[PDB]
């Protein structure tokens, strides 16, 4: 549901309301009908009630980095002229009501109409396509409403303390509306621990099985030691999902709603997700949380922290002007100074805050904020930056509460200005990284269910150590979750625990881990072996409905701006006009992610073990010379000029801190010999074209994840597998394929395998890796070609040999003026 | 900027000692070791230091 | 003044115990002007009975179980707040329930006075163990609303006795949300709805009317000062 | 099955006619065909009513023919055949 | 260059003496602070003193090493951002949002000025130039709405005209009204009228409101805020806004561009709201397309006669014409002009944006009956509910602090001083120990209220007018909800707030579309509000439009709605018609590459 | 135990223009829900009488000003806004002004018709001079609620005619507190305190009864 003004739908759909009004007689013509729209007659308001339903419109807000920042919403038709929008849409959107615009468009093809009602419709889109996370979630008001909800407060109205044998139990209710009604007279608290008799409400699983012996039916009393806000909570949830009990913190409820996609329908997930919206808004009000100068307190150790601290900032400035220190060397000592104050100000202030105070529950809420911030206001605001960018070693020890002098607030405003423009230049980047990716991809659009392959990548899922349970990977959420199984998983034993073709998910991964397999092989595109595009069976299913992936989805767009909107999240290079190169030092956010998806020589580059063996250190001055010995063959290989500036690689091996390698150790093949980067051609020509295509996803995912972003690999799989796929030839074989000369690996197994008649000698030739920007010029139609420069040649060339344009990458579609071949309009589906 | 520095510094920390005439030992290197315990006291001068002038002076 | 166009009332049988009530449509503002009203009414006016006490033989030092019963004591007073009984003396009445011989005892097993009734007989209470007994009193009396536990007894002149919070309402879960609706253009007026949980001593329309009652007497009162100038409908 | 009234569009719900077809695209182009022959029955009241069923369930006020068609395929009357 | 002045200091001791530096001297001596203390005519207190220096190092150095002084905070800020209160207390970016949306403040019928504000609002009135001042000292010897005439001393009579619902190069109002009465001795820059956003001589720009810091039921979700019905009955956030409106009877070689009442055949009924002469008759009110002005250009007779644009209206208030016959003048090739003036009373909306001077901005989700807001005890409805969750990770406090003067000034004040002045009263200045109801005071911006002036300060707050006090001295009451009638369980932060009401409306933000004209070069609509155009579907929106899947409304946006023009037609008739909505049997713009590549002698055959 | 003891009203005068009502006994949790309703029912419902529109002689529309005055039309009207009468008749009556010269204007100078009354005879409209002639007209119309400036063209066939933003609601400030006093400290009750004042058009006795009447025509619905 969207809100539509009265005035700004009756122009969108003005020819609708006067076909309308002429055939109810009320006007004569399509002039008369026309006029009559024009001076907004009393008339024409009853019409547009019965030809604005069931009539979807797209709302959309810009910039829009993916594709919720367009949905389909039904229109409400309401008096006023701002429009009406659902508070759980807004983060996708990232909007806000500080006067935010918002643009509204309409379809008029049942086509058009039929794609938002079921594509685009906002109750479809609740979850990432990037993450499989939630976005349609209780957002800062629901989340602190059901965090004191369902939060326990002890010494409560009503509590329970068993009486002891004075009355028997003082506390017990015999159903939820006994409880509201002990909640209404004043003698419960909707916070209180009570032991309530539940009917209705499924219990959970460590007592349904010690309750139950034949499936709980509802009706089947029990009895819950919880409170009454939790009950109202779970009332809210679905009739079968088991109750929770459950401070309801952000991560919870992400968590919970999580569950929910997997095992109910999404239909049923909108409607949780309102009720939740409704109750958190209810127990927001009736929350107590709001702002004064009391709720705002100062811990009593700061001044104390401060001056333990100027102590230290004076005895450096006495060495310094004694010399034993630089100016600028000082300038780095107080800053390493008045990093370690602010960090025990912070931690004295989340300490000394009780939890009940407001400013700290809207933070471990997970609504809004950080401590940085409650610091900044409460504590003291730190250090500062200069128009540099560098830091001013004296620090600002006043917070927003005592008031900043005037040259705290002076030096604040140098970082406060610089903080407008770089907010502008990083999305440049981003659009820059993007519309590379976009480039490549666009073109790599699922065609077939199955490729009919057995091949795959593994992964671990589990590690175990000393002890004995396995410690769960932190990376489940991104490599094995969301794919398909390629191997039947089996234990020591030998059955079957998930067999081919599962989805694999939280349940199918929690019984993995309950039955304790480290490795698993999975399906990706870096494997599948299909001419034109991706299987779904080997992309796997999709984030955002959680159902195996369809045949026509563009996958490639969606990798294309999973990757480029968490660009500004990013590091980046220094934005300052002219300077020295900042690559002095390690430099390593989207400068490498630009790197990789280029496959351009690494800077801080690292050899890698030709050959398996062990390994013969020796060092001069500032050179490392390494000579690996075979274990098998022979032929001792070295590498020589290695700089010394260049560390050696850290080992750091369960037990024995082996760290730097050491002169009589074991190098396997692909093992980096100093700490740094890989060239991928390197990688490439000892290893091949599926260990490279997996360096590069770790490396990128290496990169996103120290940021602190999330993304799914198989994106970044599609975007590899649209840098390898091509080879460059030396043996043209029976096939006539020119030697000298680059073509597609699936043409090359086409026109080499194909020859049973001629074939005494198959076709040859060896993989190149290429980056996005070249591999984007490598296509292989004559319309996105002259798209581009050199139309001449692309046509005469193309005109001497006949060819035809087959339509897929869908960026020549456009000229054309012709649908797409993705989703919708394909032939199985046009 | 610190990390990259110290990476660098594990080649060939201290250059040399200076025994002064009131045996105040300085050990010149090429980076700044102070004691954050003992009065910031430093225990590795830094070569661009104007108390590690008498190493190249 | 005069209303615009006589609101009207409409009530739909999700169940037999519980009902939905609409009302509309509404001037402006006045579905919260009544919704609570409605609400509190219904839950805190309308008379009843329930137990307000109980002893039983075998626990009068340690309230934690009864030998010769599977049900603690917790489980067994739960099951004696849900019973639904009635009366008529508008005094504290007392009742036993006495099961000498192991088996399983229900509401149909009480000798109730004749002016006392009980309309859930087949509700379970407990189920009595082989070579099990059972014998309990009951306080029995009427009030309104939900009043918890009275243990200002110091020296309790009964020893064993156990008070219990006592649900002397018919009514056992009423909530009410407003939404908006249109009359032909005109938006932004009131729809109340209302549902409505009563027991089975009475219908929840009974129970609608006696709240309507009551809140026309107080509002009569206030009315009663000049009785002028008033909406009419 | 355990959900409350799908309001609006939301009814017929979309996981019942995913059912219905391969995918939720054929869903588009199912609905959108089906659309253009209700609005081609509607418009032609000459013409004798052959090759045009019209809506095989009952309309409403209006109930416009996107409507109609997703709930005729929610009661599972029509076949279809891909490309 | 640009310079500011210094105090000079000479041993410790500040003397008294003035100095006009610039940047170059500046960065010649160690310049200090105006915070600094002082004991005995100048001389400082403490010992290590802090500064600036050349590179605005600060740096606390010993008394004796200073060679100037700042003269006094507020130095280094402007006039829109000296009149922020609490400005320590707010972060800069949100201080820049308050500063430049203080400038893009609507003037309102009624001003009303700050009870909390900053004692720079009384010259940048007197020094701006809207307010009027007397000239020479004297009394009132007349006092009209439009003219006021004095007598002075010297016996020489002056006579001020003021400016009455004239139109700003903005729209705004620029009414000018006195605020004297005849026999009143005024003095030389005595101020004898208000201005627009003045009241008794001091920007008043926006409105005390009673707020609640509190989220609500949903309404107030993500910056957005809501009202009282009050707000819109007492005519409180109400601004008139004019609009200006001119056409010219130019030569056109084919006669005279005539303007006239017998206009083409029209209904009468168009023509009853103008004079003889076919201009509109004042004091009428008009709507989109009503007439205003009937111009005829020759053909023999057109009608292109100046109409009411999309989504206008308002009272004529006047004209003013410019004819030939008087040969005032006209530009090259004119014979006449017309400019008709049309205003509107626009009231507080949902939708429109309103602010403080804090940074603390949103538009208005809800406006509510005075009934269903929260109340308090004494039956008071707050007027403007803001919510908790945006105040602390945007830094702004500065209005809590505000809200709680803004109490501590409405309500009055009386500081116990029977035993002594309390220790946190230890450095207020006398005068400022008691203060009647609907006071006023000054905070200024680095010397002003602090928190313990403020704190026991709240708990003084002389009672109601029935001896309850409905505020504790943590700034905080107990309201009711006004639609079930409990009280919400926890008590909540209520004081007055000044509000701005704000140029970005939504009477003027409300843009549509379905057909209109094109823009013949891109063969697009045209780009704009006032053009009357479509909006921008950029690429981005296109990649997203793809991702879904969605092929038809691709096609549908980037054919059938920009570029082709023999099919938007076919669109219009088919969906006037009621048929099913066409589709290309074959794309479009692809013809004119096919004609001139096959005109190239390259073969080309559309298969199928 | 079932209480016998039916609620009583009791009515306490604090001044001319307020009431203070009590409502004793009461079930506990039925005082607030109460004193809310019947705040409402008064804050919105309570039927009065307003100016409804306004002629003034020489001037065309509410932007302008009138010679010898020294308030523009705008203020004139922004005052006329704080206007107390009382039409005891169910149709629109013209009242009527004229003043001339240096006076100083006041509601104390409306000559009203046979039926209307002005509360506020004190009441500040303008100020003249010796060029000042304030000649007016006034209309006056029953109704409640808040209704905004009936635009001029709805009614049709008027020029000079100035609408006005009327406020019918006699009531100006409501409000309730809720003693939970016992009985005997025998078992549980309320004692609701309804506190109210007006603006001299009727007396809060009868605000409260009107209020009281509607409310019972609305729960009587509940009963068939
Ligand atoms: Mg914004
Ligand atoms: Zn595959």
Same mark, same amino acid.
């Given at each position: 549901?969207?809100?539509?003004?009265?005035?700004?739908?009756?122009?969108?759909?003005?020819?609708?309301?006067?076909?309308?009004?002429?055939?109810?007689?009320?006007?004569?013509?399509?002039?008369?009908?026309?006029?009559?729209?024009?001076?907004?007659?009393?008339?024409?308001?009853?019409?547009?009630?019965?030809?604005?339903?069931?009539?979807?419109?797209?709302?959309?807000?810009?910039?829009?980095?993916?594709?919720?920042?367009?949905?389909?919403?039904?229109?409400?038709?309401?008096?006023?002229?701002?429009?009406?929008?659902?508070?759980?849409?807004?983060?996708?959107?990232?909007?806000?009501?500080?006067?935010?615009?918002?643009?509204?468009?309409?379809?008029?093809?049942?086509?058009?109409?039929?794609?938002?009602?079921?594509?685009?419709?906002?109750?479809?889109?609740?979850?990432?396509?990037?993450?499989?996370?939630?976005?349609?979630?209780?957002?800062?008001?629901?989340?602190?409403?059901?965090?004191?909800?369902?939060?326990?407060?002890?010494?409560?109205?009503?509590?329970?303390?068993?009486?002891?044998?004075?009355?028997?139990?003082?506390?017990?209710?015999?159903?939820?509306?006994?409880?509201?009604?002990?909640?209404?007279?004043?003698?419960?608290?909707?916070?209180?621990?009570?032991?309530?008799?539940?009917?209705?409400?499924?219990?959970?699983?460590?007592?349904?099985?010690?309750?139950?012996?034949?499936?709980?039916?509802?009706?089947?009393?029990?009895?819950?030691?919880?409170?009454?806000?939790?009950?109202?909570?779970?009332?809210?949830?679905?009739?079968?999902?088991?109750?929770?009990?459950?401070?309801?913190?952000?991560?919870?409820?992400?968590?919970?709603?999580?569950?929910?996609?997997?095992?109910?329908?999404?239909?049923?997930?909108?409607?949780?997700?309102?009720?939740?919206?409704?109750?958190?808004?209810?127990?927001?009000?009736?929350?107590?949380?709001?702002?004064?100068?009391?709720?705002?307190?100062?811990?009593?150790?700061?001044?104390?922290?401060?001056?333990?601290?100027?102590?230290?900032?004076?005895?450096?400035?006495?060495?310094?002007?004694?010399?034993?220190?630089?100016?600028?060397?000082?300038?780095?000592?107080?800053?390493?100074?008045?990093?370690?104050?602010?960090?025990?100000?912070?931690?004295?202030?989340?300490?000394?805050?009780?939890?009940?105070?407001?400013?700290?529950?809207?933070?471990?809420?997970?609504?809004?904020?950080?401590?940085?911030?409650?610091?900044?206001?409460?504590?003291?605001?730190?250090?500062?930056?200069?128009?540099?960018?560098?830091?001013?070693?004296?620090?600002?020890?006043?917070?927003?509460?005592?008031?900043?002098?005037?040259?705290?607030?002076?030096?604040?405003?140098?970082?406060?200005?610089?903080?407008?423009?770089?907010?502008?230049?990083?999305?440049?980047?981003?659009?820059?990284?993007?519309?590379?990716?976009?480039?490549?991809?666009?073109?790599?659009?699922?065609?077939?269910?199955?490729?009919?392959?057995?091949?795959?990548?593994?992964?671990?899922?589990?590690?175990?150590?000393?002890?004995?349970?396995?410690?769960?990977?932190?990376?489940?959420?991104?490599?094995?979750?969301?794919?398909?199984?390629?191997?039947?998983?089996?234990?020591?034993?030998?059955?079957?625990?998930?067999?081919?073709?599962?989805?694999?998910?939280?349940?199918?991964?929690?019984?993995?881990?309950?039955?304790?397999?480290?490795?698993?092989?999975?399906?990706?595109?870096?494997?599948?072996?299909?001419?034109?595009?991706?299987?779904?069976?080997?992309?796997?299913?999709?984030?955002?409905?959680?159902?195996?992936?369809?045949?026509?989805?563009?996958?490639?767009?969606?990798?294309?701006?999973?990757?480029?909107?968490?660009?500004?999240?990013?590091?980046?290079?220094?934005?300052?006009?002219?300077?020295?190169?900042?690559?002095?030092?390690?430099?390593?956010?989207?400068?490498?992610?630009?790197?990789?998806?280029?496959?351009?020589?690494?800077?801080?580059?690292?050899?890698?073990?030709?050959?398996?063996?062990?390994?013969?250190?020796?060092?001069?001055?500032?050179?490392?010379?390494?000579?690996?010995?075979?274990?098998?063959?022979?032929?001792?290989?070295?590498?020589?000029?290695?700089?010394?500036?260049?560390?050696?690689?850290?080992?750091?091996?369960?037990?024995?801190?082996?760290?730097?390698?050491?002169?009589?150790?074991?190098?396997?093949?692909?093992?980096?010999?100093?700490?740094?980067?890989?060239?991928?051609?390197?990688?490439?020509?000892?290893?091949?074209?599926?260990?490279?295509?997996?360096?590069?996803?770790?490396?990128?995912?290496?990169?996103?994840?120290?940021?602190?972003?999330?993304?799914?690999?198989?994106?970044?799989?599609?975007?590899?597998?649209?840098?390898?796929?091509?080879?460059?030839?030396?043996?043209?074989?029976?096939?006539?394929?020119?030697?000298?000369?680059?073509?597609?690996?699936?043409?090359?197994?086409?026109?080499?395998?194909?020859?049973?008649?001629?074939?005494?000698?198959?076709?040859?030739?060896?993989?190149?890796?290429?980056?996005?920007?070249?591999?984007?010029?490598?296509?292989?139609?004559?319309?996105?070609?002259?798209?581009?420069?050199?139309?001449?040649?692309?046509?005469?060339?193309?005109?001497?040999?006949?060819?035809?344009?087959?339509?897929?990458?869908?960026?020549?579609?456009?000229?054309?003026?012709?649908?797409?071949?993705?989703?919708?309009?394909?032939?199985?589906?046009? | 900027?610190?990390?990259?520095?110290?990476?660098?510094?594990?080649?060939?920390?201290?250059?040399?000692?200076?025994?002064?005439?009131?045996?105040?030992?300085?050990?010149?290197?090429?980076?700044?070791?102070?004691?954050?315990?003992?009065?910031?006291?430093?225990?590795?001068?830094?070569?661009?230091?104007?108390?590690?002038?008498?190493?190249?002076? | 003044?005069?209303?615009?166009?006589?609101?009207?009332?409409?009530?739909?049988?999700?169940?037999?115990?519980?009902?939905?009530?609409?009302?509309?449509?509404?001037?402006?503002?006045?579905?919260?002007?009544?919704?609570?009203?409605?609400?509190?009414?219904?839950?805190?006016?309308?008379?009843?009975?329930?137990?307000?006490?109980?002893?039983?033989?075998?626990?009068?030092?340690?309230?934690?179980?009864?030998?010769?019963?599977?049900?603690?004591?917790?489980?067994?007073?739960?099951?004696?707040?849900?019973?639904?009984?009635?009366?008529?003396?508008?005094?504290?009445?007392?009742?036993?329930?006495?099961?000498?011989?192991?088996?399983?005892?229900?509401?149909?097993?009480?000798?109730?006075?004749?002016?006392?009734?009980?309309?859930?007989?087949?509700?379970?209470?407990?189920?009595?163990?082989?070579?099990?007994?059972?014998?309990?009193?009951?306080?029995?009396?009427?009030?309104?609303?939900?009043?918890?536990?009275?243990?200002?007894?110091?020296?309790?002149?009964?020893?064993?006795?156990?008070?219990?919070?006592?649900?002397?309402?018919?009514?056992?879960?009423?909530?009410?949300?407003?939404?908006?609706?249109?009359?032909?253009?005109?938006?932004?007026?009131?729809?109340?709805?209302?549902?409505?949980?009563?027991?089975?001593?009475?219908?929840?329309?009974?129970?609608?009317?006696?709240?309507?009652?009551?809140?026309?007497?107080?509002?009569?009162?206030?009315?009663?000062?000049?009785?002028?100038?008033?909406?009419?409908? | 099955?355990?959900?409350?009234?799908?309001?609006?569009?939301?009814?017929?719900?979309?996981?019942?006619?995913?059912?219905?077809?391969?995918?939720?695209?054929?869903?588009?182009?199912?609905?959108?065909?089906?659309?253009?022959?209700?609005?081609?029955?509607?418009?032609?009241?000459?013409?004798?009513?052959?090759?045009?069923?019209?809506?095989?369930?009952?309309?409403?006020?209006?109930?416009?023919?996107?409507?109609?068609?997703?709930?005729?395929?929610?009661?599972?009357?029509?076949?279809?055949?891909?490309? | 260059?640009?310079?500011?002045?210094?105090?000079?200091?000479?041993?410790?001791?500040?003397?008294?003496?003035?100095?006009?530096?610039?940047?170059?001297?500046?960065?010649?001596?160690?310049?200090?602070?105006?915070?600094?203390?002082?004991?005995?005519?100048?001389?400082?207190?403490?010992?290590?003193?802090?500064?600036?220096?050349?590179?605005?190092?600060?740096?606390?150095?010993?008394?004796? *090493?200073?060679?100037?002084?700042?003269?006094?905070?507020?130095?280094?800020?402007?006039?829109?951002?000296?009149?922020?209160?609490?400005?320590?207390?707010?972060?800069?970016?949100?201080?820049?949002?308050?500063?430049?949306?203080?400038?893009?403040?609507?003037?309102?019928?009624?001003?009303?000025?700050?009870?909390?504000?900053?004692?720079?609002?009384?010259?940048?009135?007197?020094?701006?130039?809207?307010?009027?001042?007397?000239?020479?000292?004297?009394?009132?010897?007349?006092?009209?709405?439009?003219?006021?005439?004095?007598?002075?001393?010297?016996?020489?009579?002056?006579?001020?005209?003021?400016?009455?619902?004239?139109?700003?190069?903005?729209?705004?109002?620029?009414?000018?009204?006195?605020?004297?009465?005849?026999?009143?001795?005024?003095?030389?820059?005595?101020?004898?009228?208000?201005?627009?956003?003045?009241?008794?001589?001091?920007?008043?720009?926006?409105?005390?409101?009673?707020?609640?810091?509190?989220?609500?039921?949903?309404?107030?979700?993500?910056?957005?805020?809501?009202?009282?019905?009050?707000?819109?009955?007492?005519?409180?956030?109400?601004?008139?806004?004019?609009?200006?409106?001119?056409?010219?009877?130019?030569?056109?070689?084919?006669?005279?561009?005539?303007?006239?009442?017998?206009?083409?055949?029209?209904?009468?009924?168009?023509?009853?709201?103008?004079?003889?002469?076919?201009?509109?008759?004042?004091?009428?009110?008009?709507?989109?397309?009503?007439?205003?002005?009937?111009?005829?250009?020759?053909?023999?007779?057109?009608?292109?006669?100046?109409?009411?644009?999309?989504?206008?209206?308002?009272?004529?208030?006047?004209?003013?014409?410019?004819?030939?016959?008087?040969?005032?003048?006209?530009?090259?090739?004119?014979?006449?002009?017309?400019?008709?003036?049309?205003?509107?009373?626009?009231?507080?909306?949902?939708?429109?944006?309103?602010?403080?001077?804090?940074?603390?901005?949103?538009?208005?989700?809800?406006?509510?009956?005075?009934?269903?807001?929260?109340?308090?005890?004494?039956?008071?409805?707050?007027?403007?509910?803001?919510?908790?969750?945006?105040?602390?990770?945007?830094?702004?406090?500065?209005?809590?602090?505000?809200?709680?003067?803004?109490?501590?000034?409405?309500?009055?004040?009386?500081?116990?001083?029977?035993?002594?002045?309390?220790?946190?009263?230890?450095?207020?200045?006398?005068?400022?120990?008691?203060?009647?109801?609907?006071?006023?005071?000054?905070?200024?911006?680095?010397?002003?209220? *602090?928190?313990?002036?403020?704190?026991?300060?709240?708990?003084?707050?002389?009672?109601?007018?029935?001896?309850?006090?409905?505020?504790?001295?943590?700034?905080?009451?107990?309201?009711?909800?006004?639609?079930?009638?409990?009280?919400?369980?926890?008590?909540?932060?209520?004081?007055?707030?000044?509000?701005?009401?704000?140029?970005?409306?939504?009477?003027?933000?409300?843009?549509?579309?379905?057909?209109?004209?094109?823009?013949?070069?891109?063969?697009?609509?045209?780009?704009?509000?006032?053009?009357?155009?479509?909006?921008?579907?950029?690429?981005?929106?296109?990649?997203?439009?793809?991702?879904?899947?969605?092929?038809?409304?691709? *096609?549908?946006?980037?054919?059938?709605?920009?570029?082709?023009?023999?099919?938007?037609?076919?669109?219009?008739?088919?969906?006037?018609?009621?048929?099913?909505?066409?589709?290309?049997?074959?794309?479009?713009?692809?013809?004119?590459?096919?004609?001139?590549? *096959?005109?190239?002698?390259?073969?080309?055959?559309?298969?199928?």
């Amino acid at each position: 549901q969207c809100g539509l003004p009265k005035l700004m739908a009756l122009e969108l759909f003005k020819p609708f309301v006067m076909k309308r009004l002429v055939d109810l007689n009320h006007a004569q013509n399509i002039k008369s009908a026309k006029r009559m729209v024009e001076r907004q007659r009393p008339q024409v308001w009853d019409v547009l009630e019965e030809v604005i339903a069931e009539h979807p419109v797209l709302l959309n807000r810009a910039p829009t980095l993916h594709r919720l920042g367009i949905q389909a919403f039904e229109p409400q038709l309401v008096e006023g002229k701002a429009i009406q929008l659902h508070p759980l849409v807004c983060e996708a959107f990232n909007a806000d009501f500080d006067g935010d615009q918002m643009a509204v468009h309409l379809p008029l093809s049942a086509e058009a109409q039929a794609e938002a009602r079921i594509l685009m419709l906002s109750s479809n889109n609740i979850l990432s396509p990037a993450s499989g996370k939630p976005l349609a979630m209780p957002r800062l008001d629901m989340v602190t409403g059901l965090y004191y909800l369902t939060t326990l407060v002890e010494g409560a109205t009503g509590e329970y303390q068993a009486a002891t044998k004075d009355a028997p139990e003082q506390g017990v209710y015999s159903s939820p509306a006994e409880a509201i009604m002990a909640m209404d007279r004043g003698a419960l608290s909707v916070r209180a621990k009570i032991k309530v008799r539940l009917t209705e409400l499924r219990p959970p699983t460590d007592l349904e099985a010690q309750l139950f012996e034949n499936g709980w039916k509802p009706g089947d009393a029990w009895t819950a030691e919880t409170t009454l806000g939790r009950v109202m909570f779970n009332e809210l949830l679905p009739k079968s999902y088991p109750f929770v009990n459950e401070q309801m913190h952000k991560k919870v409820q992400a968590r919970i709603i999580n569950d929910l996609a997997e095992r109910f329908p999404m239909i049923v997930v909108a409607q949780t997700v309102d009720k939740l919206k409704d109750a958190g808004f209810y127990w927001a009000t009736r929350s107590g949380v709001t702002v004064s100068m009391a709720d705002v307190l100062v811990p009593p150790q700061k001044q104390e922290i401060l001056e333990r601290h100027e102590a230290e900032a004076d005895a450096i400035e006495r060495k310094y002007q004694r010399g034993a220190l630089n100016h600028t060397e000082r300038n780095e000592s107080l800053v390493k100074i008045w990093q370690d104050a602010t960090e025990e100000v912070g931690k004295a202030l989340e300490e000394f805050y009780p939890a009940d105070n407001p400013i700290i529950t809207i933070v471990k809420s997970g609504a809004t904020g950080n401590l940085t911030q409650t610091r900044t206001l409460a504590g003291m605001k730190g250090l500062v930056t200069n128009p540099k960018g560098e830091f001013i070693p004296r620090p600002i020890k006043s917070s927003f509460r005592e008031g900043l002098t005037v040259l705290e607030y002076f030096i604040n405003t140098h970082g406060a200005r610089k903080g407008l423009a770089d907010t502008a230049l990083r999305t440049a980047d981003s659009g820059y990284l993007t519309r590379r990716l976009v480039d490549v991809s666009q073109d790599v659009i699922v065609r077939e269910h199955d490729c009919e392959t057995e091949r795959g990548i593994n992964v671990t899922l589990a590690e175990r150590g000393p002890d004995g349970t396995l410690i769960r990977d932190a990376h489940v959420e991104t490599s094995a979750f969301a794919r398909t199984l390629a191997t039947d998983a089996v234990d020591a034993n030998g059955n079957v625990i998930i067999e081919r073709g599962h989805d694999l998910g939280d349940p199918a991964i929690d019984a993995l881990l309950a039955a304790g397999i480290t490795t698993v092989k999975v399906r990706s595109v870096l494997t599948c072996t299909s001419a034109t595009g991706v299987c779904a069976m080997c992309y796997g299913r999709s984030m955002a409905t959680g159902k195996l992936v369809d045949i026509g989805e563009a996958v490639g767009i969606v990798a294309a701006q999973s990757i480029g909107e968490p660009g500004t999240q990013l590091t980046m290079r220094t934005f300052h006009q002219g300077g020295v190169t900042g690559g002095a030092d390690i430099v390593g956010g989207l400068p490498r992610v630009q790197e990789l998806f280029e496959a351009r020589v690494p800077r801080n580059k690292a050899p890698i073990a030709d050959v398996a063996g062990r390994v013969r250190l020796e060092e001069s001055d500032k050179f490392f010379k390494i000579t690996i010995v075979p274990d098998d063959g022979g032929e001792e290989v070295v590498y020589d000029k290695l700089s010394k500036r260049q560390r050696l690689r850290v080992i750091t091996h369960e037990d024995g801190t082996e760290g730097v390698l050491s002169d009589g150790d074991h190098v396997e093949v692909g093992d980096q010999l100093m700490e740094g980067a890989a060239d991928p051609h390197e990688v490439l020509r000892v290893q091949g074209p599926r260990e490279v295509q997996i360096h590069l996803v770790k490396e990128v995912q290496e990169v996103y994840r120290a940021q602190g972003v999330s993304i799914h690999d198989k994106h970044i799989e599609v975007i590899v597998r649209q840098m390898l796929r091509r080879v460059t030839i030396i043996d043209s074989g029976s096939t006539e394929f020119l030697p000298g000369s680059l073509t597609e690996r699936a043409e090359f197994e086409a026109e080499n395998r194909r020859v049973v008649a001629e074939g005494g000698e198959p076709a040859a030739g060896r993989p190149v890796l290429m980056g996005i920007t070249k591999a984007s010029l490598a296509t292989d139609s004559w319309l996105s070609a002259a798209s581009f420069q050199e139309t001449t040649r692309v046509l005469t060339d193309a005109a001497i040999n006949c060819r035809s344009d087959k339509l897929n990458g869908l960026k020549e579609n456009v000229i054309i003026g012709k649908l797409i071949p993705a989703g919708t309009g394909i032939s199985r589906y046009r | 900027k610190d990390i990259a520095r110290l990476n660098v510094a594990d080649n060939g920390l201290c250059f040399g000692r200076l025994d002064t005439l009131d045996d105040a030992r300085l050990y010149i290197g090429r980076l700044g070791i102070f004691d954050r315990d003992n009065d910031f006291e430093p225990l590795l001068l830094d070569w661009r230091a104007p108390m590690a002038r008498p190493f190249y002076v | 003044m005069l209303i615009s166009q006589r609101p009207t009332l409409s009530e739909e049988t999700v169940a037999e115990n519980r009902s939905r009530f609409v009302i509309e449509p509404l001037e402006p503002g006045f579905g919260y002007t009544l919704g609570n009203s409605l609400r509190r009414t219904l839950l805190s006016s309308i008379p009843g009975a329930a137990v307000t006490s109980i002893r039983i033989d075998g626990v009068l030092h340690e309230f934690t179980t009864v030998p010769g019963v599977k049900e603690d004591v917790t489980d067994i007073i739960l099951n004696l707040k849900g019973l639904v009984v009635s009366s008529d003396d508008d005094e504290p009445v007392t009742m036993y329930l006495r099961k000498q011989g192991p088996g399983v005892v229900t509401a149909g097993d009480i000798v109730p006075p004749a002016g006392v009734t009980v309309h859930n007989p087949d509700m379970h209470i407990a189920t009595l163990n082989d070579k099990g007994k059972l014998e309990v009193e009951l306080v029995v009396e009427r009030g309104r609303g939900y009043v918890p536990a009275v243990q200002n007894k110091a020296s309790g002149a009964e020893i064993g006795r156990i008070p219990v919070d006592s649900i002397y309402s018919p009514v056992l879960k009423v909530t009410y949300k407003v939404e908006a609706t249109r009359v032909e253009q005109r938006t932004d007026f009131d729809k109340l709805i209302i549902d409505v949980e009563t027991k089975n001593s009475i219908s929840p329309r009974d129970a609608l009317a006696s709240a309507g009652g009551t809140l026309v007497e107080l509002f009569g009162l206030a009315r009663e000062l000049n009785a002028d100038s008033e909406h009419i409908e | 099955s355990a959900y409350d009234t799908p309001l609006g569009i939301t009814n017929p719900p979309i996981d019942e006619l995913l059912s219905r077809a391969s995918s939720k695209y054929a869903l588009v182009i199912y609905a959108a065909k089906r659309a253009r022959q209700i609005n081609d029955y509607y418009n032609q009241l000459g013409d004798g009513i052959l090759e045009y069923v019209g809506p095989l369930v009952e309309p409403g006020l209006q109930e416009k023919p996107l409507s109609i068609a997703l709930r005729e395929i929610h009661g599972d009357l029509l076949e279809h055949t891909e490309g | 260059f640009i310079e500011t002045p210094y105090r000079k200091v000479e041993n410790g001791v500040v003397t008294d003496q003035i100095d006009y530096l610039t940047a170059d001297e500046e960065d010649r001596h160690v310049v200090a602070q105006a915070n600094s203390p002082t004991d005995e005519n100048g001389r400082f207190t403490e010992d290590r003193v802090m500064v600036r220096k050349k590179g605005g190092e600060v740096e606390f150095v010993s008394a004796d *090493q200073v060679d100037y002084m700042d003269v006094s905070p507020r130095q280094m800020v402007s006039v829109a951002t000296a009149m922020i209160p609490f400005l320590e207390h707010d972060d800069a970016n949100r201080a820049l949002m308050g500063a430049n949306m203080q400038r893009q403040a609507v003037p309102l019928v009624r001003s009303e000025a700050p009870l909390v504000g900053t004692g720079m609002e009384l010259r940048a009135a007197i020094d701006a130039g809207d307010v009027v001042v007397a000239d020479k000292t004297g009394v009132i010897e007349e006092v009209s709405a439009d003219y006021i005439t004095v007598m002075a001393d010297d016996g020489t009579r002056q006579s001020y005209r003021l400016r009455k619902f004239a139109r700003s190069n903005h729209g705004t109002c620029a009414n000018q009204r006195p605020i004297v009465d005849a026999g009143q001795r005024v003095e030389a820059g005595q101020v004898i009228a208000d201005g627009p956003c003045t009241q008794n001589g001091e920007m008043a720009l926006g409105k005390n409101l009673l707020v609640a810091i509190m989220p609500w039921e949903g309404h107030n979700y993500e910056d957005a805020i809501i009202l009282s019905n009050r707000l819109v009955e007492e005519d409180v956030l109400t601004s008139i806004h004019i609009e200006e409106h001119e056409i010219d009877a130019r030569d056109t070689k084919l006669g005279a561009e005539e303007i006239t009442r017998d206009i083409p055949n029209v209904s009468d009924e168009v023509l009853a709201d103008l004079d003889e002469r076919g201009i509109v008759r004042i004091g009428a009110e008009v709507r989109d397309g009503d007439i205003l002005v009937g111009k005829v250009t020759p053909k023999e007779v057109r009608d292109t006669s100046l109409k009411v644009p999309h989504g206008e209206s308002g009272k004529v208030i006047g004209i003013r014409v410019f004819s030939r016959e008087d040969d005032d003048e006209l530009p090259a090739g004119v014979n006449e002009l017309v400019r008709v003036y049309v205003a509107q009373k626009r009231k507080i909306s949902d939708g429109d944006k309103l602010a403080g001077r804090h940074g603390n901005k949103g538009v208005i989700g809800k406006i509510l009956p005075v009934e269903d807001m929260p109340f308090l005890p004494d039956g008071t409805p707050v007027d403007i509910i803001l919510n908790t969750h945006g105040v602390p990770r945007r830094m702004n406090i500065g209005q809590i602090l505000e809200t709680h003067l803004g109490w501590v000034a409405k309500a009055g004040w009386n500081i116990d001083v029977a035993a002594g002045v309390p220790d946190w009263a230890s450095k207020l200045p006398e005068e400022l120990y008691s203060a009647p109801a609907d006071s006023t005071v000054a905070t200024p911006v680095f010397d002003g209220a *602090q928190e313990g002036e403020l704190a026991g300060l709240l708990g003084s707050t002389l009672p109601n007018r029935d001896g309850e006090v409905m505020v504790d001295a943590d700034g905080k009451s107990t309201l009711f909800d006004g639609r079930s009638g409990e009280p919400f369980p926890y008590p909540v932060t209520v004081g007055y707030m000044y509000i701005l009401k704000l140029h970005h409306l939504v009477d003027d933000k409300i843009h549509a579309r379905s057909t209109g004209p094109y823009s013949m070069i891109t063969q697009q609509p045209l780009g704009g509000k006032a053009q009357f155009g479509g909006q921008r579907f950029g690429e981005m929106e296109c990649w997203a439009m793809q991702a879904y899947g969605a092929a038809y409304t691709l *096609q549908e946006l980037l054919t059938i709605k920009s570029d082709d023009t023999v099919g938007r037609v076919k669109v219009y008739e088919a969906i006037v018609k009621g048929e099913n909505i066409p589709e290309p049997g074959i794309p479009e713009s692809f013809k004119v590459l096919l004609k001139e590549l *096959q005109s190239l002698c390259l073969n080309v055959e559309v298969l199928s």
